Amino acid sequence: NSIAIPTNFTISVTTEIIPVSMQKVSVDCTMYICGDSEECSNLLLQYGSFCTQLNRALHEIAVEQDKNTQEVFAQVKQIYKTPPIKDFGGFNFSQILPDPSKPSKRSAIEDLLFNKVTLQKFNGLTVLPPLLTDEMIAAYTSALLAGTITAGWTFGAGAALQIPFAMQMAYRFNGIGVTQNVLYENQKLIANQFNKAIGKIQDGLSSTASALGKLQDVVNQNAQALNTLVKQLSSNFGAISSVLNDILSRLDPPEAEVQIDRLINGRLQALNTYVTQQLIRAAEIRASANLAAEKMSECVLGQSKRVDFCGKGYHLMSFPQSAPHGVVFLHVTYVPTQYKNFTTAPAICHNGKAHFPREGVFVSNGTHWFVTQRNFYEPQIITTDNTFVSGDCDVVIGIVNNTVYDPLQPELDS
Amino acid sequence: NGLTVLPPLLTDEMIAAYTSALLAGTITAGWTFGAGAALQIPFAMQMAYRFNGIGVTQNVLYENQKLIANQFNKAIGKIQDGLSSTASALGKLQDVVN
Amino acid sequence: QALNTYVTQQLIRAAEIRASANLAAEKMSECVLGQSKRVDFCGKGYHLM
Amino acid sequence: NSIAIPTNFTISVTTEIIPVSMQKVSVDCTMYICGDSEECSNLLLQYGS
Amino acid sequence: YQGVNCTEVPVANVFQTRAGCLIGAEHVNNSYECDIPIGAGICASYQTASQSIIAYTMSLGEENSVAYSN
Ligand SMILES: *[C@@H]1O[C@H](CO)[C@@H](O[C@@H]2O[C@H](CO)[C@@H](O[C@@H]3O[C@H](CO[C@H]4O[C@H](CO)[C@@H](O)[C@H](O)[C@@H]4O)[C@@H](O)[C@H](O[C@H]4O[C@H](CO)[C@@H](O)[C@H](O)[C@@H]4O)[C@@H]3O)[C@H](O)[C@H]2NC(C)=O)[C@H](O)[C@H]1NC(C)=O
Ligand SMILES: *[C@@H]1O[C@H](CO)[C@@H](O[C@@H]2O[C@H](CO)[C@@H](O[C@@H]3O[C@H](CO)[C@@H](O)[C@H](O)[C@@H]3O)[C@H](O)[C@H]2NC(C)=O)[C@H](O)[C@H]1NC(C)=O
Ligand SMILES: *[C@@H]1O[C@H](CO)[C@@H](O[C@@H]2O[C@H](CO)[C@@H](O)[C@H](O)[C@H]2NC(C)=O)[C@H](O)[C@H]1NC(C)=O
Ligand SMILES: *[C@@H]1O[C@H](CO)[C@@H](O[C@@H]2O[C@H](CO)[C@@H](O)[C@H](O)[C@H]2NC(C)=O)[C@H](O)[C@H]1NC(C)=O
Ligand SMILES: *[C@@H]1O[C@H](CO)[C@@H](O[C@@H]2O[C@H](CO)[C@@H](O)[C@H](O)[C@H]2NC(C)=O)[C@H](O)[C@H]1NC(C)=O
Ligand SMILES: *[C@@H]1O[C@H](CO)[C@@H](O)[C@H](O)[C@H]1NC(C)=O
Ligand SMILES: *[C@@H]1O[C@H](CO)[C@@H](O)[C@H](O)[C@H]1NC(C)=O
Numbered sequence: 001n002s003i004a005i006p007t008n009f010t011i012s013v014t015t016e017i018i019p020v021s022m023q024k025v026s027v028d029c030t031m032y033i034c035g036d037s038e039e040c041s042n043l044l045l046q047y048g049s050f051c052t053q054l055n056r057a058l059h060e061i062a063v064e065q066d067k068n069t070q071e072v073f074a075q076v077k078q079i080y081k082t083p084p085i086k087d088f089g090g091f092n093f094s095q096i097l098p099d100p101s102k103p104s105k106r107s108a109i110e111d112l113l114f115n116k117v118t119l120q121k122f123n124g125l126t127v128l129p130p131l132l133t134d135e136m137i138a139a140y141t142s143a144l145l146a147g148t149i150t151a152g153w154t155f156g157a158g159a160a161l162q163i164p165f166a167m168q169m170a171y172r173f174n175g176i177g178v179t180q181n182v183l184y185e186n187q188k189l190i191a192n193q194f195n196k197a198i199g200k201i202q203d204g205l206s207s208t209a210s211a212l213g214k215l216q217d218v219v220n221q222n223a224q225a226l227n228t229l230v231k232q233l234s235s236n237f238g239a240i241s242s243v244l245n246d247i248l249s250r251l252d253p254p255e256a257e258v259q260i261d262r263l264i265n266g267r268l269q270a271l272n273t274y275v276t277q278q279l280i281r282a283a284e285i286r287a288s289a290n291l292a293a294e295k296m297s298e299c300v301l302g303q304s305k306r307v308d309f310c311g312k313g314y315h316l317m318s319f320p321q322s323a324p325h326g327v328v329f330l331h332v333t334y335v336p337t338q339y340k341n342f343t344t345a346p347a348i349c350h351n352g353k354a355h356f357p358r359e360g361v362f363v364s365n366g367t368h369w370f371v372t373q374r375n376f377y378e379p380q381i382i383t384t385d386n387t388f389v390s391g392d393c394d395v396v397i398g399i400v401n402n403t404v405y406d407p408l409q410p411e412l413d414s
Numbered sequence: 415n416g417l418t419v420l421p422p423l424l425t426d427e428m429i430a431a432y433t434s435a436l437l438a439g440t441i442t443a444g445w446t447f448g449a450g451a452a453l454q455i456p457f458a459m460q461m462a463y464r465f466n467g468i469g470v471t472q473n474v475l476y477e478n479q480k481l482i483a484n485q486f487n488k489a490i491g492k493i494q495d496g497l498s499s500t501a502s503a504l505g506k507l508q509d510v511v512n
Numbered sequence: 513q514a515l516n517t518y519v520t521q522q523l524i525r526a527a528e529i530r531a532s533a534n535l536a537a538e539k540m541s542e543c544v545l546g547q548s549k550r551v552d553f554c555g556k557g558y559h560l561m
Numbered sequence: 562n563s564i565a566i567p568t569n570f571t572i573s574v575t576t577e578i579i580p581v582s583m584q585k586v587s588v589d590c591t592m593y594i595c596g597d598s599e600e601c602s603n604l605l606l607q608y609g610s
Numbered sequence: 611y612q613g614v615n616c617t618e619v620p621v622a623n624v625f626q627t628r629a630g631c632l633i634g635a636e637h638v639n640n641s642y643e644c645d646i647p648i649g650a651g652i653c654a655s656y657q658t659a660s661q662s663i664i665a666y667t668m669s670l671g672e673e674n675s676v677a678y679s680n
């Protein structure tokens with residue numbers, strides 16, 4: 001017959017990391033298999049069109065990488081600029097917005113993230129640069145962040161005017177079922193907690209260098225695959241030697257061709273295995289990129305009601321940050337604290353009628369009965385305006401004797 | 415010779431314990447699952463809250479509680495009987511094993 | 513060659529199983545611990561628990 | 562100008578099954594390919610990794 | 611020619627970019643949208659005068675200046 005209602009809350013900010021893109025690789029099959037040997041090329045010509053398929057697959061992967069990046073980032077039509085004012089109602093955004101003085105237009109957190117992953121094989125193997133440079137990605141992220149902060153709910157509506165931040169916070173508080181007056185009465189404390197959480201995140205990022213394991217894994221896997229492909233050249237696969245010139249200068253054509261065929265078969269198998277594994281990994285990366293784009297759309301541009309989709313707790317807002325081959329999200333949530341026990345009831349039994357609250361629960365400390373919201377303690381005197389009348393005092397199980405008051409009569413008779 | 419099967423890290427007893435803990439938490443704490451709380455919210459209150467969640471007033475549940483409980487128990491019993499009768503319900507996992 | 517074929521098939525099956533496990537985790541989080549309003553995501557009809 | 566409004570309802574319970582995990586398998590390549598024969602292992606040594 | 615500098619390309623209208631050296635393109639220092647991607651933020655298009663290449667740096671969009679009132 002009891003219930004606990006929070007009398008305090010806190011603001012928490014958490015981090016999320018999602019890989020997006022992958023390194024682009026182009027491989028020349030002929031140079032890898034039968035490099036600088038025209039006779040080896042003539043022998044390989046008997047195998048038809050094996051190399052073209054691998055080249056086409058690698059080209060498709062390379063195109064898909066840029067498509068993934070474009071899908072994730074390029075979502076805003078225009079470019080907003082950093083507001084020259086810093087009157088955000090006490091909230092601090094200096095550590096996230098770009099520094100006008102720095103040569104590169106990153107922020108402190110972005111600089112730390114980029115520095116956190118600072119840690120030949122050209123034989124026919126080449127790496128192509130991405131279509132979008134890091135500066136363009138940072139510009140897109142800054143434009144998104146500035147536009148969101150400045151506009152609020154009028155972001156993608158062309159002509160707009162700066163909506164005050166406190167109104168956006170009040171709207172978000174209304175989103176989770178808390179009356180807006182709480183923010184207007186605890187603005188300073190909320191801002192202080194938010195700033196402290198941001199500082200704690202910055203300190204944690206600056207302390208440990210093992211927080212970007214998700215991207216480090218992708219980088220290491222690609223590097224190891226390329227290392228294995230390179231190291232495969234030294235094998236002989238049962239032939240006389242691993243050098244074409246040795247076979248040419250040591251054996252007669254009729255069996256030198258056999259040795260060359262053996263080497264060709266081995267190298268073709270290695271190339272095929274590498275290409276297939278790259279295809280599978282690219283599919284996984286594409287799935288991750290789709291998830292990242294969905295999260296961007298559903299979290300940065302609006303408030304989400306899905307449970308545990310934006311971190312633990314009731315979602316308020318989130319901010320994006322760039323990263324090497326990935327993104328970083330900073331989710332800001334709401335966590336109630338300091339629960340206190342109370343005694344409750346399902347209904348109030350008046351003179352023959354039953355009363356149910358419009359929105360809230362019936363609570364009492366032993367003598368007085370109040371109606372209050374569910375995620376914050378704020379009692380009010382029970383009134384005929386707060387309730388809703390239906391039925392009698394017979395069917396409800398656990399109904400409680402009390403009195404419902406009306407302020408209309410004291411004004412009517414005065 | 416070369417083929418070997420390694421055991422899972424979590425034994426099924428631990429999985430059952432995790433499931434039971436989740437069920438008990440969601441059946442006792444109600445909407446205060448995760449925070450301090452540590453008190454039992456009445457079940458009918460959670461039912462009324464979720465009834466309101468789909469645009470139905472709470473009086474409906476508070477007046478039909480007995481019928482609602484009977485229907486829920488009957489549905490649970492029917493599911494148990496159906497599981498005990500038909501042997502071709504877990505094909506989704508049977509296919510993976512096969 | 514037989515070993516290579518088996519390994520590739522196992523890798524593809526592992527990818528499918530991982531996708532299914534992600535779906536299961538999402539369903540647990542959005543249905544056991546809260547009420548879902550997505551239509552037909554948590555049963556046929558209005559969802560309760 | 563006609564509408565239909567229900568005057569009664571029912572409570573239904575359904576079932577949903579989702580696979581989560583596969584079976585872990587480990588394979589020894591040398592034993593499978595060239596088991597117990599050292600000549601076969603010596604020949605396999607030239608094939609790489 | 612990808613990944614090489616044209617100080618040695620005549621062996622096998624010039625302009626050196628971050629993706630190689632481009633032959634037959636007219637360099638401009640304006641900014642437009644991308645019609646044909648090249649790499650490293652460089653994009654090419656056909657606009658007239660005869661219809662010739664123009665090689666330009668990519669543009670991310672148009673600026674929006676929202677006024678500032680609290
Ligand atoms: C909330 O918002 C307020 C503004 O409304 C910020 O207030 C100022 O913020 C700036 C930038 O964070 C602070 O400047 C930094 O101060 C550091 C410490 O300063 C003390 O120690 C130095 C010794 O070197 C003294 O010279 C100085 O007078 C202070 O006594 C410096 O170490 C920083 O230098 C580093 O950053 C700058 C870029 O800002 C680089 O150019 C430098 O090379 C160096 O890398 C920097 O100068 C400033 O002190 C704050 N003032 C006040 C009154 O608060 C809050 O910082 C902000 N809080 C959060 C959490 O965001
Ligand atoms: C909505 O529909 C259901 C099912 O059609 C209705 O349930 C039925 O309710 C009536 C009275 O509420 C039950 O009659 C009673 O039956 C018991 C046991 O037989 C008997 O002891 C009583 O004297 C009385 O006759 C009826 O049995 C029950 N149906 C079933 C299958 O059990 C329900 O009433 C409907 N709701 C409304 C608001 O009409
Ligand atoms: C929640 O608890 C905190 C304690 O950390 C309260 O913060 C105190 O607030 C009062 C007035 O608002 C100040 O005089 C104290 O100095 C604060 N204490 C600390 C440690 O900062 C906060 O007020 C509580 N929330 C509510 C709504 O009362
Ligand atoms: C307090 O509860 C008692 C139940 O014991 C109510 O008493 C009944 O009241 C009705 C009309 O209000 C009478 O017809 C019954 O005869 C009463 N029964 C008894 C045993 O006294 C009482 O009305 C309730 N008071 C309030 C303010 O709700
Ligand atoms: C393309 O490669 C050639 C290789 O010789 C570069 O020529 C020299 O490059 C180094 C640094 O890469 C400079 O310090 C030298 O001054 C260059 N030589 C001369 C004579 O200037 C050439 O610079 C490269 N192209 C670009 C755009 O970097
Ligand atoms: C608070 O109420 C709970 C019942 O919900 C009870 O178990 C506990 O002892 C109470 N604590 C105090 C300090 O009254
Ligand atoms: C219960 O709370 C109300 C409102 O704060 C107060 O008037 C009343 O005295 C309290 N009862 C007790 C027993 O403290």
Ligand SMILES: *[C@@H]1O[C@H](CO)[C@@H](O)[C@H](O)[C@H]1NC(C)=O
Pocket residue numbers: 001345346397398
């Ligand atoms: C709590 O349980 C007691 C008996 O254990 C019962 O009398 C009481 O009515 C219950 N509480 C409510 C609110 O019904």
Ligand SMILES: *[C@@H]1O[C@H](CO)[C@@H](O)[C@H](O)[C@H]1NC(C)=O
Pocket residue numbers: 638639640
């Ligand atoms: C482009 O660069 C040239 C030389 O660097 C300069 O003369 C010209 O004015 C520039 N174009 C524009 C539009 O400024």
